[PDB]
């Protein structure tokens, strides 16, 4: 099966969190987002 | 719990929001 909605967005990094939340919530009105700072080793 | 219904967004104190291009 496949998860509908934009399964992979572009790269709005630094494009304001709220902004990205609008594009993600607008593309997949069936998914929520969570804001969090950095800490764990993320894909460098 | 990173499902296709939960998007995590990271933010670097540098004053930027590192949002993962993908969901989980």
From Swiss-Prot, chain A:
Residue positions of the PTM N-acetylserine? 1
Q: Keywords in UniProt for this one? A: Acetylation, Disulfide bond, Protease inhibitor, Serine protease inhibitor
Residues annotated as transmembrane: none
Report the GO molecular function annotations.
serine-type endopeptidase inhibitor activity
Q: Does the keyword Nucleotide-binding apply?
A: no
List each coiled-coil range.
Answer: none
**GO terms for biological process, alphabetical:** response to wounding
Name the family the entry cites. Belongs to the protease inhibitor I13 (potato type I serine protease inhibitor) family.
Q: What does this protein do?
A: Specifically inhibits both trypsin and activated Hageman factor.
Q: What is this protein called?
A: Inhibitor of trypsin and hageman factor
Q: Which residues of the full protein are shown?
A: 1 to 44 of 68
């Amino acid at each position: 099966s496949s998860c509908p909605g934009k399964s992979s967005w572009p790269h709005l990094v630094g494009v304001g969190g709220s902004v990205a939340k609008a594009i993600i919530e607008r593309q997949n009105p069936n998914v929520k987002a969570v804001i969090l700072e950095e800490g764990t080793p993320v894909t460098k | 719990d990173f499902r296709c219904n939960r998007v995590r967004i990271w933010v670097n104190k540098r004053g930027l929001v590192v949002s993962p291009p993908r969901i989980g």
